[PDB]
Design a protein around this ligand. Structure first.
Ligand SMILES: Nc1ncnc2c1ncn2[C@@H]1O[C@H](COP(=O)(O)O)[C@@H](OP(=O)(O)O)[C@H]1O
Ligand SMILES: COc1cc(C=O)ccc1O
Length: 336
């Protein structure tokens, strides 16, 4: 029994959201007291997601979006499969590390547009319909240790995750970097279909009117679990600064041991210079059927901490600073 309320967004704000975000064509929902924001298909799959059966030897990466999930997934997958770079190259990351809730963002009306554009390639159409189905099925079939990506906040996780004491890597990135990256993602992915500019998109981000917001609640619930035996909390920013330390810390958490030389190999493999040319971690399967707008910046983009952003303005930076102070006041959360 899915225990939290699901309410369509107030109708006038829901209308504006439908005008700016063309990947959704029914409406947006807010979930529970915290008003967790999602497209209409959350109402439809809530029960499936909540009752999804975790296993004790699952490895879960939970993050707010564009907080360093893909980087972390590749690191973790290799650490838990004897650094098997060959298999990592030949199986896509989305197959090795399935995205639990991706299917929420594949609307019927929008899937009709993908199918029309691929309507001559039966395999391309079988792939597109599969994107519409919960990953949870293929995952339940698996008889090997599983790797699961989610942006579901702690409080919206399948309860079997903590019940089974499965391992969770929670990664947090700073709001400024997340806002700019998230905007690019919303323009890149036709499943989102965002048309407006960064100023408009930041205003939606600040009002928690983007998928998986409230951002600050997502981070607080993360931080609140970081003392648990089965949780590892890390800042993207520290992971960028000291890879050898990140890899070794992550390996220790998962109960794995590797030589200075294996860590060195992993540093080369996970450097952005090599990673952005890596077949298995760029979304080649998705770009092949036209789900990605090719024009935009790429799912593996820059990977910088507080790097140059043309989109960012003094007025947005000052609001981001204020929004940071109202939310982090009387907590010990500090981005490095
Ligand atoms: N090998 C790597 N090193 C550092 N950052 C990486 C990386 N691969 C991907 N990223 C960055 O992680 C962010 C996306 O995170 P996620 O996987 O959670 O969507 C993007 O941020 P930018 O758009 O700031 O470059 C992306 O470029
Ligand atoms: C491939 O990763 C993602 C895809 C989407 C598409 O709507 C949203 C969030 C993600 O993290």
């Amino acid at each position: 029994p899915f225990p939290y309320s699901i309410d369509f967004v107030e109708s006038k704000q829901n209308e504006q959201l439908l005008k700016d975000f063309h990947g959704e064509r029914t409406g947006f929902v807010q979930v529970g007291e915290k008003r967790w924001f999602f497209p209409s298909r959350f109402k439809q799959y809530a029960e499936s997601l909540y009752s999804f059966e975790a296993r004790p030897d699952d490895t879960w990466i939970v993050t707010y979006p564009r907080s360093g999930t893909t980087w972390s997934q590749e690191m973790v997958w290799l650490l838990c499969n004897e650094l098997d770079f060959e298999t990592a190259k030949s199986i896509p990351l989305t197959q090795r590390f399935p995205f639990l809730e991706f299917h929420l963002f594949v609307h019927d009306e929008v899937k009709a547009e993908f199918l029309k554009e691929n309507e001559h390639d039966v395999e391309s159409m079988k792939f597109i319909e599969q994107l519409s189905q919960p990953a949870g099925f293929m995952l339940a079939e698996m008889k090997t240790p599983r790797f699961i990506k989610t942006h579901l906040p702690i409080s919206l996780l399948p309860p079997s995750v903590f019940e089974q004491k499965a391992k969770i890597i929670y990664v947090a990135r700073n709001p400024s970097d997340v806002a700019v990256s998230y905007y690019h993602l919303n323009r890149l992915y036709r499943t989102q279909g965002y048309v407006g500019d960064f100023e408009t998109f930041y205003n939606y981000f600040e009002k928690d009117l983007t998928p998986w917001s409230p951002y600050w609640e997502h981070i607080k619930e993360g931080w609140a679990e970081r003392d648990r035996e089965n949780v590892l909390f890390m800042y993207y920013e520290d992971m960028k600064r000291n890879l050898p330390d990140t890899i070794r810390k992550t390996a220790a958490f998962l109960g794995k041991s590797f030589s200075d030389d294996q860590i060195d190999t992993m540093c080369t493999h996970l450097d952005i210079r090599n990673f952005r040319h890596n077949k298995s971690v760029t979304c080649e399967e998705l770009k092949a059927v036209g789900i990605l707008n090719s024009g935009e910046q790429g799912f593996v983009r820059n990977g910088q901490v507080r790097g140059n952003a043309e989109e960012m303005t003094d007025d947005i930076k000052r609001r981001l600073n204020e929004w940071t102070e109202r939310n982090l006041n009387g907590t010990d959360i500090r981005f490095p």
